[PDB]
């Protein structure tokens, strides 16, 4: 079963519903409601990642996709400046970002009914193999972010499990670096895509609130 597989690798995984309930509740105490809140995402643009945005979309009205290949916010600081303009009058922003990974009905990681994450996996093979382009400009940027994780990916026990871990790690550092330059609440972690008739999962690894200044006002971790 897939449940067993997920709970094994990631015992702290919450269901999408649990994730959204968890987050909405907490952010309620800080002024976050349905129509004063910009939901921004930085998830991979493969369609399997849609369920998380959909679930969060019901609770928060307007939405902004900031996600590039593999879930990287490679719009960078300029892209962030664009997002800030979508924030409602007197509003705040919620940023959900994360890597993602498929796990099949047969409990297999790195896939779900093809490769998932396709883009991460691709770049994984490219950086490990070499451990031993305006037409694909972003895939190259994904490779660059994954280069420092090469050793870990070859040394890894199970690679299709270590991969989204490594991708979230690189995303986290980037997002932090970007926010620091530029209230905004931040959810970060690992998205887990399961078979259609089955709830998806999210591993929370960062849940905090920052100010217009740039310092961490709260940390729910």
Rounded to an integer, what distance in angstroms lies between the CA atom of residue 126 and that of residue 61? 39
Note whether 38 and 87 are within 8 A (CB).
Answer: yes
Q: Does the protein bind its own copies through residue 137 (CB under 8 A)? A: yes
Bridge partners, 207 (sequence order): 187
C-alpha closest to that of 206 among 221, 184, 190, 185: 221
Termini Cα distance of the chain: 30
Cα–Cα distance, 66 to 47 (Å, whole number): 15
CB of 112 to its own copies, least distance (A): 12
* Residue 66 burial (10 A CB sphere; 0-12, 13-18, 19+): buried
Site size for Zn ion (CB under 5 A): 3
Taking CB under 8 A as the criterion, which residues in 86-105 touch its own copies? 86
Q: Is 195 in the site for Cl ion (CB under 5 A)?
A: yes
10-18, 41-49, 152-160, 210-218 -> range binding its own copies (CB under 8 A):
41-49
- Pick from 26, 53, 65, 105: which binds Cl ion (CB under 5 A)? 105
SS3 11: coil
Query: By C-beta, is 113 or 130 nearer to Cl ion?
Result: 113
Q: Is 111 in the site for its own copies (CB under 8 A)?
A: no
| Interaction site with its own copies (CB under 8 A) | 44-47, 64-65, 68-69, 74-79, 81-83, 85-86, 118-119, 122, 133-139, 141, 144-145, 174, 177-178, 181
Footprint on this chain of Cl ion (rule: CB under 5 A): 104-105, 112-113, 195
């Amino acid at each position: 079963v897939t449940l067993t597989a997920v709970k094994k690798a990631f015992p702290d995984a919450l269901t999408n519903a649990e994730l959204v309930a968890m987050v909405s509740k907490r952010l309620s105490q800080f002024g976050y409601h349905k129509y004063n809140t910009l939901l921004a995402t930085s998830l991979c643009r493969d369609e399997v990642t849609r369920p998380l945005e959909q679930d969060f979309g019901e609770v928060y009205g307007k939405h902004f996709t900031m996600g590039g290949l593999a879930g990287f916010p490679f719009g960078g600081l300029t892209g962030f400046g664009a997002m800030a303009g979508h924030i409602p009058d007197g509003g705040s922003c919620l940023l959900i970002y994360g890597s993602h990974v498929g796990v099949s009905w047969e409990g297999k990681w790195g896939t779900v009914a093809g490769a998932c994450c396709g883009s991460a996996v691709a770049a994984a093979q490219a950086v490990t193999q070499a451990y031993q382009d305006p037409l694909d400009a972003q895939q190259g940027y994904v490779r660059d972010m994954l280069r420092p994780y090469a050793a870990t990916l070859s040394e890894a026990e199970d690679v299709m499990v270590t991969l989204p871990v490594s991708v979230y790690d690189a995303q986290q550092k980037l997002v932090t670096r970007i926010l620091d330059e530029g209230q905004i609440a931040v959810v970060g972690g690992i998205q887990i895509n399961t078979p259609k008739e089955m709830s998806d999962f999210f591993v929370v690894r960062r849940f905090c609130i920052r100010d217009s200044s740039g310092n961490m006002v709260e940390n729910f971790m």
